[PDB]
Amino acid sequence: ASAPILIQGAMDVEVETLVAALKDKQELTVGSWTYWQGTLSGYPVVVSRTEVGLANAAAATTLAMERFQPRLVINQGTAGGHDPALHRGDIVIGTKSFNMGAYRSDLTPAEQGVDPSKWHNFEVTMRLRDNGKLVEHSSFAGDPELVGRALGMADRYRHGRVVPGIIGTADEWNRQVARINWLHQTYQTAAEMETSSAALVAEAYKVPFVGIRVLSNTDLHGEEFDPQTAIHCQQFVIDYAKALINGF
Amino acid sequence: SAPILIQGAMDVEVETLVAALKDKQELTVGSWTYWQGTLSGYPVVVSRTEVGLANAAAATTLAMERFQPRLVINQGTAGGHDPALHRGDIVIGTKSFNMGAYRSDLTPAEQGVDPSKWHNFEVTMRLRDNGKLVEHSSFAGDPELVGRALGMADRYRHGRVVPGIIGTADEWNRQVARINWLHQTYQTAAEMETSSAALVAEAYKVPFVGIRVLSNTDLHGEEFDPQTAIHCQQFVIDYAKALINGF
Ligand SMILES: CSC[C@H]1O[C@@H](n2cnc3c(N)ncnc32)[C@H](O)[C@@H]1O
Numbered sequence: 052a053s054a055p056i057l058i059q060g061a062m063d064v065e066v067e068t069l070v071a072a073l074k075d076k077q078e079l080t081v082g083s084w085t086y087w088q089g090t091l092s093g094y095p096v097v098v099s100r101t102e103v104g105l106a107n108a109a110a111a112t113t114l115a116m117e118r119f120q121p122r123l124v125i126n127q128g129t130a131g132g133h134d135p136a137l138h139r140g141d142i143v144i145g146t147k148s149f150n151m152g153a154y155r156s157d158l159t160p161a162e163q164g165v166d167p168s169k170w171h172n173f174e175v176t177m178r179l180r181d182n183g184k185l186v187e188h189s190s191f192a193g194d195p196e197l198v199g200r201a202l203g204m205a206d207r208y209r210h211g212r213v214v215p216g217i218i219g220t221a222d223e224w225n226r227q228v229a230r231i232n233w234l235h236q237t238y239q240t241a242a243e244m245e246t247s248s249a250a251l252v253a254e255a256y257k258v259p260f261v262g263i264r265v266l267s268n269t270d271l272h273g274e275e276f277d278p279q280t281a282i283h284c285q286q287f288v289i290d291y292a293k294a295l296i297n298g299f
Numbered sequence: 300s301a302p303i304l305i306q307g308a309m310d311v312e313v314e315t316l317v318a319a320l321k322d323k324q325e326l327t328v329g330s331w332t333y334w335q336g337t338l339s340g341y342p343v344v345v346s347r348t349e350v351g352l353a354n355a356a357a358a359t360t361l362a363m364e365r366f367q368p369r370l371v372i373n374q375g376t377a378g379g380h381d382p383a384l385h386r387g388d389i390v391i392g393t394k395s396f397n398m399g400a401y402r403s404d405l406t407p408a409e410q411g412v413d414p415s416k417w418h419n420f421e422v423t424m425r426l427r428d429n430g431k432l433v434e435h436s437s438f439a440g441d442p443e444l445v446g447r448a449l450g451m452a453d454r455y456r457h458g459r460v461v462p463g464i465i466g467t468a469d470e471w472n473r474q475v476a477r478i479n480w481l482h483q484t485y486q487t488a489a490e491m492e493t494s495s496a497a498l499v500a501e502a503y504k505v506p507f508v509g510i511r512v513l514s515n516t517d518l519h520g521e522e523f524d525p526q527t528a529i530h531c532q533q534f535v536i537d538y539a540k541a542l543i544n545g546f
């Protein structure tokens with residue numbers, strides 16, 4: 052039996068198009084996490100609805116590893132823009148993802164108040180063990196061949212640009228524009244709740260991973276959430292997965 | 300014969316537990332090591348989770364799939380948020396929650412950044428049960444498990460054992476004003492894994508309790524003392540043995 056491609060999305064709107072594309076489906080739920088097992092172009096594919104945020108993403112990914120032993124993972128869905136060059140509908144291919152919500156601060160007394168510009172990325176949250184030995188990570192690189200394939204397919208996407216970028220994952224939805232700008236300037240983020248958590252689990256299991264995110268919103272351009280972007284992202288991802296399958 | 304699962308993030312938070320197990324067998328999958336043995340003749344699995352919300356959720360989910368535990372004790376060290384508490388005191392989690400989850404309202408760049416305006420973003424704790432959405436603003440420690448730990452308070456001789464609210468985040472805060480604000484806003488006793496492990500335990504409907512020793516608190520100038528992690532494990536061993544006596 053052939054090891055499946057695992058394709059993830061957090062919300063119903065981010066998976067319904069993927070699920071509709073599968074043939075010969077069955078649906079499995081364990082705990083809080085649902086999976087649809089079927090085929091695309093005759094090849095096994097599992098679609099996972101992860102639910103939202105880092106804990107949910109890590110659980111859903113781990114459970115998929117244990118149940119399905121996928122050959123690669125595509126985490127996809129929507130995101131908010133951090134780079135002013137990007138607009139709603141543009142797709143970011145994650146050259147890296149990282150836990151943007153991880154914060155450590157030096158000691159300051161009460162009289163100095165609160166200063167988030169002094170909250171630094173706390174890399175221990177991405178530290179893993181490999182065969183028992185500690186391995187530091189400041190980010191997780193998208194598998195570079197998977198990243199490159201998606202960039203090479205850019206002109207197959209009908210609804211915006213496809214760009215490489217850094218995906219900042221956090222249990223956050225930021226709409227303070229000064230904070231978005233600070234995160235972009237500090238971490239070079241393209242967009243901002245699951246990617247790096249799923250990536251962390253994929254790294255632990257040594258399974259190739261790529262994050263593919265459409266901007267559904269950006270407060271840098273007054274562009275409010277458009278759910279149709281989620282459908283467009285899934286269409287691109289289906290094309291992308293079919294191209295991988297043709298190569299298997 | 301379903302085991303008790305006992306978790307800690309760091310080596311210092313599990314090696315005392317591991318030393319207590321009889322007939323140990325070790326298993327490593329991905330980044331996560333488990334020791335399967337017995338305490339008082341009953342199956343116990345000790346899990347070294349690694350640090351933070353993603354690691355805790357992965358390690359807990361992996362344990363659910365591999366071992367099907369009957370209850371989960373998540374333990375380790377924490378930082379004080381309540382000025383009444385000192386290094387060495389143990390907090391039993393009446394509830395835990397994702398303190399690091401934030402949503403903010405739209406503000407233009409001219410208005411700057413104001414974390415006091417950020418709201419707790421509860422969607423990060425939302426689950427599905429038989430496919431249907433279930434909101435959570437926190438995860439209650441199993442109240443019988445909580446009560447048992449409080450009832451055993453006088454068996455711990457290195458501080459007080461108190462009920463409190465555990466704030467989980469991928470954060471180590473040392474801005475005292477931020478600690479104070481979080482305490483005032485969320486009533487936290489202490490502050491990187493508990494609510495994430497608790498979320499997975501809720502999804503699998505397995506009783507859960509968080510037990511955290513304060514290894515540090517910047518509210519009293521008390522810096523990290525690793526011996527607190529050993530003392531916490533000693534208490535947890537006693538606690539697990541009491542549960543086992545009752546099985
Ligand atoms: C309902 S919570 C938001 C969901 O959509 C994603 N998302 C879309 N836009 C944003 C944004 N601006 N900030 C954070 N998460 C976002 C998140 O990864 C999560 O799964």
Ligand SMILES: CSC[C@H]1O[C@@H](n2cnc3c(N)ncnc32)[C@H](O)[C@@H]1O
Nearest residue numbers: 308350376377378470471490491492
């Ligand atoms: C090495 S990162 C800190 C580890 O110890 C815990 N911890 C101890 N003290 C604190 C603290 N003040 N703030 C956040 N996490 C703490 C965390 O849950 C994590 O596993």
